[PDB]
Write a protein that binds this ligand. Sequence first.
Ligand SMILES: C=CC[Se]c1ccc(S(N)(=O)=O)cc1
Ligand SMILES: C=CC[Se]c1ccc(S(N)(=O)=O)cc1
Ligand SMILES: [Zn+2]
Length: 259
Amino acid sequence: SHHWGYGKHNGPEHWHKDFPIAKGERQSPVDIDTHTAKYDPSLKPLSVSYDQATSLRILNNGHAFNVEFDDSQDKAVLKGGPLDGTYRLIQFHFHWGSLDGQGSEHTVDKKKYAAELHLVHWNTKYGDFGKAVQQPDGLAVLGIFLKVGSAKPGLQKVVDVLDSIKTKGKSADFTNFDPRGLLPESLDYWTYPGSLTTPPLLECVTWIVLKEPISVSSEQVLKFRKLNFNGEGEPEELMVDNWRPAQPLKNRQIKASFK
Ligand SMILES: C=CC[Se]c1ccc(S(N)(=O)=O)cc1
Ligand SMILES: C=CC[Se]c1ccc(S(N)(=O)=O)cc1
Ligand SMILES: [Zn+2]
């Protein structure tokens, strides 16, 4: 069974033994060298269409928490930019640190942010998520950096439910949440071909990483850090530092949407 995690004994340096693609040619995350990334005029406009997003539930899966959506129809979709066709929102989750100076997966000129939000979408030409992850263009992940400063009002409904999903396997109703409240003002982004950042590490993702971070409060991120990796009644292991480090860029170029 799967026993990977984020500790010294089962963390990112161990993953390759059960998931050999860990050492592949298009792994994520990566460092974004801002000086080397080039404006690409071939990028069509990005279209984030979350008006009809239908959230359902929040789950602690023992690695992060997922806010899950109804993806049985095209209720919330991502299109445009580097993408061909229509990608359906399935869930979002975060990666974060034990302290504010680490937590993001992607880095920007080697700078680590306090956390990173991943809005996960699957290409509807493949019919279901499980089929999509087996294709090089199956998923689109919209990544958004979090810095600590002023509170993010649209994040607070998430923060407030976390005490009800402390431990692995716990879930709670999470209807009527609007994920548009987690975006920054600007949709300027970087994009490159990569992978899932957890096992199974499949090389199925078009990454779209927004340049502008969102600001969250220290109090908000401190609440993330009270979650547990463990299940109920087990010795407490705080859910912190659930991020994979940057991986080799290899034969890839990061493109910018902006001049
Ligand atoms: C107590 C020692 C760890 Se058991 C173990 C460790 C790592 C993995 S892996 N290759 O899936 O990350 C799988 C199983
Ligand atoms: C079979 C797939 C596992 Se579900 C999943 C979705 C997204 C990510 S991430 N961190 O790359 O956005 C990681 C894992
Ligand atoms: Zn993620």
